[PDB]
Design a protein around this ligand. Structure first.
Ligand SMILES: [Zn+2]
Lengths: 382, 330, 77, 586
């Protein structure tokens, strides 16, 4: 059992220390198994060796873990990353001087899944910001430059890795337990990620998805929330929200009108941006989720600021098939099928935002949107 | 908020080249020399040379954007910079290691640039001011060996472009580093000197002396050690004023003033980031005289002298390790 | 066979026994025996010129009592 | 480490020094002078004026420079220090080495002696100072071969000089630290750290009671120290260059000094104004020995970097023009080989010595072929050039002024030479293998009976030395002594496997192979390096009398039919790729 192993190391680490190389070879072999009982014991054999042995055998523990993360096995990489996180939390000072070897995993991100890349950045970020000593500051600025040269990489995969790593670092950077100079430093990191991902729509979508998950599941400093909510709210208004007074204009081969309104107003300018692509409209749903969460966090669940987005109409064409389904060309249906998907995704995200309300007419609008999702979904199969 | 100083865009892991180019651009007489070589080549062509042409294009490009910004500062909002794409491409032909988007040594690329400039000068002079590198970066060393048995002296003459000095023992100042370079050292034990006067292996004393001094003193800091290769993050105490009289064959009153530092940011030697910090030597440009510009790729800042030296001090541990120091003759 | 000097990373001078026909690969292997630095990480500077792999010591006119300087690569980008 | 086999090409009796003399010891009881030569040989000379031939014996057991010697136990025992990192105990009456002390890690440069306690200290470049009692050293036997070591410590740089007083209570060390460190040999405790010298110290003296110390340094100054006050009470600057040798009288009032400037002075310690130029030597003075038979000393023996040892009378010092112009007594010296050239066959060497004489030697037979007199050395090399190439298989060192040939595992067997090409009358021969069998000819383990390689024989008196590459001498013997019971037992432990393979197992070394390209002048082939051009000529002939119709070319040059591929690759090819040969019909 764990307690037998814990008691063994605790009082008789003097005799076990002579054979740290032998124990680690045993620990490494145990980790190659397929049973959780064996895998958990092998991970414990790594953790107890790091805790009770000397500096040299501790470097062997970290070096052994780095090999597992670079091995390729999903089971080994996941387990070894958990061991590394435990070691960082347990003994940040000992892991502080082993960061050079941990940094070396960044050279082998090709054979690592995006889920494991996020975890690898989390342990690196939490180790770099564990202490405020001069040793940490070297790693902190080292981690910033690694991501900075990944964000600007021409290779698209490394551009996405830079977004994942930079959003992950900002979570530890702004984690609530923050001075102004830290608050502007994390803000500058986000401004870097925003600028780099602006051109690519799918890369821009990843930034919204990763940063929204950070707001939802992590508690950050209020000042950090103050800036992010301000920049998102105004940019979203300028990007998609348009006034309903001004009639639409363009060279559209379809009649463009305001559709799916409720009951001088704002509207979602969905169709012209989609047509001009013949902020991207493909990012409308992930961006709005980011806006909703940031507004919610500052006001502690209160959401009067985005009330108009629920009932605002959507600029859409005559989506009902007027006995012209066969005459429709391939380009027109392919465009319109994407029109339905973006409209459905917007309505699904709208439902997500206002599903926790209490007021009666507040709920009826959500149900009306839910009805709109169902009926407009039937139109999709046409 | 944009300063009237043109940065260089990162073409992918090319801050090693950007830091060198910004130092070379502000090096006294380097722009003048490259222009002179271009004139000779252009007239010779109109009557191997690509690197001189590529350097000329980059210098002109930096000059024009600097000119345009002064006339119409409203044309540029985020950053003022240019791309050394042509110069980088020439380096790929001269040296195949630069093909790709890998990370490279900043001193090595400076050596490649200066080495090929001298080759072009020699070829042009052979076919035929012309001594660009030699008057600027090249000096003369006198290396003396003293056998401890017979006490006979043997001397060697060797040129040098940079002075490679240690930063660690195996706080310390730049004086200590040059002492470990040029002061007398005893080679004993496994490294005994073979005296041809004794026809035997003997202990000897080796000392290096500066015979001819160039206009620019480049100091290459060995901020890296072996046991296994690691990076030494602790700098020396770099002074603004440097006198090499202690290690010179003749007594000189000529002192040198620091005007450029190339730094490396990173915890390892295999990867990192290179930045350059240069001291500034039409009417609006004189407000930056005596100030230091930090060239982080396409971003240019400005720092007061007293603040910049404190940033170099080992007491306030900096994340950017000095790697190349450039001193110009006063 | 001649004797040359190499100033190592600490500034400490070591000695090598070399032939004028020895290639730069051979010289770098000798330094590895005395310093432990792999030849692929070694940069040898003689008279301000880096010694290129594939050439010999006679190409650079390296003779007895000539001093090389050993540096590594500080890679950045 | 890797074991190397080396041997010396010399005569059986080397009567005269073949290099400089580092130390001197005078025996007043038997009137005998001992010279520690740089040629690794200690010699005994009779200082009696009657003897026209002063040579007595040669004490030859060291393998490098002998740096210091001390004559102890009323002239019965001699202790010697050497650059081969060993201290050796000798029987000064018979002239044989009794034991070897291997405690030092570098060159041993100094030997201090205390007459009263029979205490001897040895210091060297390993920064160590060991104390020895001679009676314990002399009492050692085959079974009793263990000694307790008491080593002084505290010196941070290589020692070049050492001194003790008559009573054995004070020991002073001189080094490149530029300071003098003093201990007490009885308690091995540090006493003081004298400072004031600005360079290396090579000479040290003490009085009978050990209260004053004289030191000469490479800075050219002689300093008199007071151990009671721990200060320099006087400094004498009488030499232009560094002071290397010091001698003082029994009254400790006059100091005799000599150094690199080649001049020897007698200076009164009470007043430095009284200085007498004894002589002006022809070489830098390494050591001096005073003749203490009478007070004042009648004469002084001077050892220099030359092979000649001179005695200068001191009659009239106490009674610049030198006092003496010619030495009273002269010990003859030999010539030192200073230049060496290995010919293209890797079998003969041209040497030039300090007398400008040029000699022709045979490495394989380990003997001299002929003396060429004072012929120009460079011209003789050109007059003996041959268009052949043999790979290097040996190395030459001239550290002792003699020809020492070293054989290493890396290249000992790299030279395959046909018998016809050599002087042996054709089967293929390996020069390194043949030499090894000739060196170990008398070893019974190499007998299967025939003896040796069957072609040649090295002289029986050839000293064969086994030592670690850049290390210590494992075993030294003469060629003819391998058959003895003691030597054979020692050879079994020292001879490495790569020598056993060829001399005992009689295995044959590898044959180097050089691939080459045959292309038609307007199919890669691999052949032995010894293959002649005729063999390649006839191969093309069978592909398409062979000598007459086919001419082979390389680099647009004709190839001699008798020339071999190994020679072609070296001279004509002048390229770093596989040797290409072009065939065309005559
Ligand atoms: Zn010498």
């Amino acid at each position: 059992q764990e307690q037998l192993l814990q008691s063994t190391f605790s009082v008789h680490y003097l005799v076990l220390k002579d054979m740290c190389s032998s124990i680690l070879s045993l620990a490494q072999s145990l980790l190659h198994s397929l049973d959780q009982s064996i895998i958990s014991f092998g991970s414990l054999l790594y953790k107890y060796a790091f805790k009770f042995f000397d500096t040299y055998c501790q470097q062997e523990v970290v070096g052994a873990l780095v090999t597992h993360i670079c091995s390729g096995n999903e089971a080994e990489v996941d387990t070894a990353l958990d061991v590394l996180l435990e070691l960082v939390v347990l003994n940040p000072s000992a892991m502080m001087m082993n960061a050079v070897f941990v940094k070396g995993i960044l050279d082998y991100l090709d054979n690592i899944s995006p889920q494991q890349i996020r975890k690898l950045f989390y342990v690196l970020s939490t180790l770099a910001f564990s202490k405020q000593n001069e040793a940490s500051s070297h790693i902190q600025d080292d981690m910033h430059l690694v991501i900075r040269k990944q964000l600007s990489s021409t290779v698209f995969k490394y551009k996405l890795i830079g977004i994942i790593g930079a959003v992950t670092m900002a979570g530890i950077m702004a984690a609530d337990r923050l001075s102004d100079e830290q608050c502007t430093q994390v803000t500058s990191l986000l401004q870097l990620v925003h600028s780099c991902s602006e051109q690519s729509p799918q890369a821009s979508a990843l930034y919204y998805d990763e940063f929204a998950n950070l707001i939802q599941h992590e508690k950050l400093d209020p000042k950090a929330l103050e800036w992010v909510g301000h920049t998102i709210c105004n940019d979203f208004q300028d990007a998609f929200v348009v006034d309903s007074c001004v009639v639409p204009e363009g060279d559209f081969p379809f009649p463009v009108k305001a559709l799916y309104g409720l009951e001088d107003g704002i509207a979602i300018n969905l169709l012209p941006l989609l047509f001009s692509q013949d902020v991207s409209p493909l990012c409308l749903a992930p961006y709005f989720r980011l806006l909703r969460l940031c507004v919610e966090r500052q006001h502690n669940g209160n959401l009067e600021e985005i009330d108009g987005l629920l009932d605002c109409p959507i600029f859409l064409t005559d989506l009902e098939p007027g006995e012209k389904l066969e005459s429709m060309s391939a380009k027109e249906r392919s465009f319109m099928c994407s029109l339905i998907f973006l409209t459905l995704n917007w309505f699904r995200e709208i439902v997500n935002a206002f599903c926790q309300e209490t007021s009666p007419e507040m709920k009826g609008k959500v149900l009306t949107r839910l009805k709109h999702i169902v009926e407009l979904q039937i139109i999709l199969e046409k | 908020n944009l300063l009237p100083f043109v940065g260089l865009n990162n073409l992918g892991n090319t801050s090693y080249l950007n830091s060198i180019l910004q130092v070379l651009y502000f090096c006294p007489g380097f722009k003048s020399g490259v222009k002179h070589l271009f004139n000779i080549i252009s007239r010779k062509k109109e009557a191997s040379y690509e690197l001189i042409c590529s350097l000329q294009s980059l210098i002109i490009s930096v000059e024009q954007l600097q000119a345009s910004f002064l006339l119409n500062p409203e044309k540029y909002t985020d950053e003022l910079a240019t791309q050394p794409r042509r110069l980088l491409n020439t380096l790929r032909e001269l040296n195949p290691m630069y093909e790709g988007y890998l990370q490279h040594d900043a001193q090595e690329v400076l050596q490649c640039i200066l080495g090929n400039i001298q080759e072009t000068c020699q070829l042009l002079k052979k076919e035929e001011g012309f001594e660009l590198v030699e008057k600027l970066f090249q000096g003369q060393l006198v290396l003396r060996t003293r056998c401890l048995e017979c006490e006979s002296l043997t001397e060697r003459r060797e040129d040098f472009q940079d002075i490679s000095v240690p930063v660690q023992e195996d706080m310390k100042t730049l004086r200590w580093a040059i002492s470990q370079f040029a002061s007398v050292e005893r080679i004993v034990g496994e490294d005994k000197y073979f005296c041809e006067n004794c026809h035997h292996y003997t202990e000897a004393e080796r000392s290096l002396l500066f015979d001819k001094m160039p206009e620019v003193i480049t100091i290459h800091l060995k901020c890296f050690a072996a046991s296994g290769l690691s990076k030494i993050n602790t700098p020396l105490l770099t002074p603004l004023k440097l006198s090499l009289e202690e290690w010179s064959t003749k007594p000189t009153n000529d002192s040198y003033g620091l005007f450029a530092v190339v730094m490396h940011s990173g915890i390892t030697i295999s990867s990192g980031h290179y930045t350059a910090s240069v001291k500034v030597t039409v009417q609006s440009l004189k407000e930056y005289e005596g100030k230091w510009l930090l060239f982080d790729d396409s971003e240019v800042k400005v720092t007061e002298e007293k603040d910049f030296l404190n940033s170099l001090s080992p007491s306030t541990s900096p994340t950017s390790t000095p790697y190349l120091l450039f001193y110009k003759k006063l | 066979s001649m004797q040359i000097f190499v100033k190592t990373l600490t500034g400490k001078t070591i000695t090598l026994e070399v032939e004028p026909s020895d290639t730069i690969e051979n010289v770098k292997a000798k330094i590895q025996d005395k310093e432990g630095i792999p030849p692929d990480q070694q940069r040898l500077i003689f008279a301000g010129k880096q010694l290129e792999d594939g050439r010999t010591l006679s190409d650079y006119n390296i003779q007895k009592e000539s001093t090389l300087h050993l540096v590594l690569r500080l890679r950045g980008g | 480490r890797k074991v190397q086999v080396s041997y010396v090409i010399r005569d059986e009796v080397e009567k005269y020094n073949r290099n400089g003399v580092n130390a001197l010891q005078l025996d007043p009881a038997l009137n005998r002078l001992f010279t520690a030569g740089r040629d690794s040989i200690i010699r005994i000379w009779s200082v009696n004026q009657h003897k026209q031939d002063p040579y007595i014996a040669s004490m030859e057991h060291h393998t490098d420079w002998v740096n210091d010697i001390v004559l102890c136990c009323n002239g019965k025992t001699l202790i010697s220090a050497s650059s081969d990192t060993t201290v050796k105990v000798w029987n000064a009456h018979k002239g044989f080495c009794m034991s070897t002390l291997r405690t030092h890690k570098d060159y041993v440069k100094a030997l201090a002696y205390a007459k009263d306690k029979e205490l001897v200290a040895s210091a060297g470049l390993d920064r160590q100072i060991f104390l020895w009692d001679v009676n314990t050293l002399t009492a050692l036997t085959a079974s009793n071969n263990t000694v307790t070591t008491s080593s002084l410590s505290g010196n941070k740089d290589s020692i070049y000089s050492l001194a003790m007083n008559q009573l054995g209570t004070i020991i002073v060390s001189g080094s490149t630290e530029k300071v003098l460190r003093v201990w007490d040999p009885r308690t091995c405790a540090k006493l003081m750290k004298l400072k004031g010298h600005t360079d290396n110290v090579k000479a040290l003296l003490l009085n009978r009671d050990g209260t004053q110390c004289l030191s000469g340094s490479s800075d050219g100054t002689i300093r008199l120290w007071s151990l009671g006050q721990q200060r320099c009470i006087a400094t004498y600057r009488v030499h232009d260059e560094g002071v290397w040798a010091l001698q003082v009288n029994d009254a400790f009032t006059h100091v005799y000094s000599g150094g690199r400037d080649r001049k020897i002075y007698c200076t009164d310690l009470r007043n430095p104004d009284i200085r007498v130029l004894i002589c002006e030597e022809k070489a830098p003075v390494l050591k001096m020995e005073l003749d203490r038979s009478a007070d004042p000393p009648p004469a002084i023996w001077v050892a220099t970097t030359k092979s000649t040892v001179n005695k200068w009378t001191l009659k009239g010092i106490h009674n610049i023009t030198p006092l003496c112009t010619q030495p009273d007594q002269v010990i003859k010296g030999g010539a030192s080989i200073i230049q060496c050239h290995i010919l293209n066959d890797k079998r003969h060497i041209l040497t030039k010595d300090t007398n400008n004489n040029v000699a022709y030697w045979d490495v394989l037979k380990a003997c001299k072929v002929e003396d060429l007199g004072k012929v120009d050395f460079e011209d003789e090399i050109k007059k003996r050039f041959k268009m052949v190439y043999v790979p290097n298989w040996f190395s030459v060192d001239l550290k002792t002024g003699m020809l020492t040939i070293t054989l290493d595992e890396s290249d000992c067997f790299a030279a395959w030479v046909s018998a016809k090409d050599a002087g042996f009358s054709d089967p293929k021969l390996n020069l390194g293998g043949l030499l090894l069998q000739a060196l170990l000819e008398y070893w019974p383990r190499t007998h299967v009976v025939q003896k040796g390689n069957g072609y040649f024989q090295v002289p029986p008196h050839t000293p064969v030395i086994f030592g670690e590459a850049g290390g210590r001498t494992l075993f030294r013997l003469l060629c003819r002594d391998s058959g003895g019971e003691t030597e054979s037992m020692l050879l079994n432990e020292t001879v490495p496997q790569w020598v056993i393979d060829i001399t005992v197992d009689k295995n044959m070394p590898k044959f180097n192979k050089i691939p080459f390209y045959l292309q038609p002048h307007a199919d890669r082939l691999s052949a032995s390096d010894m293959l002649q051009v005729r063999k390649v000529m006839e191969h093309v002939y069978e592909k398409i009398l062979a000598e007459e119709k086919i001419e082979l070319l390389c680099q647009d040059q004709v190839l001699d039919p008798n020339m071999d591929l190994r020679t072609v690759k070296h001279f004509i090819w002048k390229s770093g790729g596989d040797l290409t040969l072009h065939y065309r019909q005559k």
